[PDB]
């Protein structure tokens, strides 16, 4: 509970996708530190504020049917950071779709997230 060790990073990151897949918005939002920023998709301004991280997520996961799965292991550093590949199954244009995503996270001392960057574009989005 201090800065996560690489093995522990592999744990918080993978929690984090479970939770997202099970749809627990409230549990997602206790993972973020108070000053934490969300860039999703990377390219677009950091979000920020705990009401605001919680409206972000509630806009993405509210309607309960999203499924998110890792598609390879969590790469983890020794300075409390990591990156992961995954896929998301969602709805676009009324129809089911997927989306391949990569997250990079830094974990502050308190084992909470501080930055989250998500990489994807249309170029990753596939209609099923």
Of 112, 105, 114, 109, give the one whose Cα is nearest residue 2: 109
Q: Is 12 in the site for a second copy (CB under 8 A)?
A: no
Site string for a second copy, 17-46 (x = CB under 8 A): ------------------------xxx---
Out of 23, 60, 85, 111, name the contact with a second copy by CB under 8 A. Answer: 85
What is the rounded distance in angstroms from the CA atom of residue 70 to the CA atom of residue 93?
A: 24
Q: Is 101 in the site for a second copy (CB under 8 A)?
A: yes
- Smaller CB separation from Mg ion, 21 or 89: 21
Strand-pairing partners, residue 69, are 87
Out of 30, 77, 91, 110, name the contact with a second copy by CB under 8 A. Answer: 77
What is the rounded distance in angstroms from the CA atom of residue 31 to the CA atom of residue 18?
A: 12
What is the rounded distance in angstroms from the CA atom of residue 44 to the CA atom of residue 11?
A: 28
Contact 64, 49 (CB under 8 A): no
Catalytic residue at 119?
Answer: no
Q: Is 2 in the site for a second copy (CB under 8 A)?
A: no
Q: Is 76 in the site for a second copy (CB under 8 A)?
A: yes
**Dihedral (Cα; 23, 28, 30, 35), 10-degree rounding:** -150
Active site residues: 16, 40
Where is the binding site for substrate, in residues? 103
Where is the binding site, in residues? 103
């Amino acid at each position: 509970m201090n800065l996560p060790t690489a093995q522990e990073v592999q744990g918080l990151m993978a929690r984090y996708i479970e939770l997202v897949d099970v749809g627990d918005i409230e549990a997602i939002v206790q993972m973020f530190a108070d000053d934490a920023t969300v860039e999703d998709p990377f390219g677009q301004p950091p979000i920020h504020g705990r009401e605001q991280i919680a409206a972000f997520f509630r806009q993405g996961l509210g309607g309960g049917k999203v499924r998110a799965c890792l598609t390879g292991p969590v790469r983890a550093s020794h300075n409390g950071c990591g990156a992961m590949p995954f896929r998301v199954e969602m709805v676009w244009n009324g129809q089911p779709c997927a989306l391949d995503v990569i997250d990079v996270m830094r974990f502050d001392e308190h084992g909470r997230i501080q930055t989250m960057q998500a990489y994807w574009s249309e170029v990753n989005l596939s209609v099923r």
